[PDB]
């Protein structure tokens, strides 16, 4: 996260760390959406241009974390993957369209002050909250700058950006399965996700029920916190049917 702040303890209890077994390293961010399902970005698990194609056995899920590098004894819980599900039309070849995957845990994790699921938006929350100007929040253990590693979970509030501004900011073809967030160069304030923040949650606090919803997944950006550039997030609601379907069918 660039230009963010340290997370408060318990501020993001849905925050998950995708961790590589060997060599032990952070691979990505992710979110807890129930006691057995973790939401992440497709490209965290599969991205042939970088020779990335992770299998279940390659990974651990670390839930409840604060520190980036520490084993947080009695606090974090490390989970094993039973199954990973990538969107069948995840477009890794061109623009990361539909950049979303589910990970089923082997055993359920136990909720706690530090471990708790985020909601997934319904059409009405999406419609009400996914508006230009409305701010969401993004968290991750990724890089502090484009060119670095944070000691604790980083947090940044970023305004959703107008779709045409999004489109005019890049040569990449953007889709309805994406939205962009970030300040405009003259809004002064800045901040963005960066490398290692991938698959982490863009969340918003609904003012109607006071509940945190995950509207986005950290998906892609060109550089990090570059002026006139915006972070791109997987539009979670738009892919919700796939989410429910995968969860309903496989449990």
């Amino acid at each position: 996260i660039v230009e963010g702040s340290d997370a408060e303890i318990g501020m993001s209890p849905w925050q998950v760390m995708l961790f590589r077994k060997s060599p032990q390293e952070l691979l990505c961010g992710a979110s807890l959406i129930s006691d057995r399902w973790v939401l992440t970005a497709a490209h965290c698990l599969l991205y042939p241009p970088w020779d990335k194609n992770f299998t279940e056995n390659d990974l651990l899920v670390r839930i409840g974390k604060h520190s980036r590098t520490r084993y947080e004894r009695n606090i974090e819980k490390i989970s094993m993957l039973e199954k990973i599900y990538i969107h069948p039309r995840y477009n890794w070849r061109e623009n990361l369209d539909r950049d979303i995957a589910l990970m089923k845990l082997k055993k359920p994790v136990a909720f706690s002050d530090y471990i708790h699921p985020v909601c997934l938006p319904d059409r009405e929350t999406a419609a009400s909250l996914l508006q230009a100007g409305y701010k969401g929040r993004v968290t991750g253990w990724g890089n502090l700058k484009e060119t670095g590693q944070p000691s604790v979970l980083q947090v940044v509030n970023l305004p959703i950006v107008e779709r045409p501004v999004c489109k005019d900011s890049t040569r990449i073809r953007i889709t309805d399965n994406m939205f962009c967030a970030g300040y405009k160069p003259d809004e002064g304030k800045r901040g963005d996700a960066c490398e290692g923040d991938s698959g982490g949650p863009f969340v918003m606090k609904s003012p109607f029920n006071n509940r945190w919803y995950q509207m986005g997944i950290v998906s892609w950006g060109e550089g990090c916190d570059r002026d006139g550039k915006y972070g791109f997030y997987t539009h979670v609601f738009r892919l919700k049917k796939w989410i429910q379907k995968v969860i309903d069918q496989f449990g």
Binding site: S5, G10, S34, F111, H116, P117, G133, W212, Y213
Partner: peptide
């Protein structure tokens, strides 16, 4: 789940985090 999005150390205790107000203010 049914308790989703309510954080044990903030919403469940009626405590707020330091910057969630900033989001509220933007939901204009």
């Amino acid at each position: 789940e049914a308790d989703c999005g309510l954080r044990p150390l903030f919403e469940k205790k009626s405590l707020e985090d330091k910057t969630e107000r900033e989001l509220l203010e933007s939901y204009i």
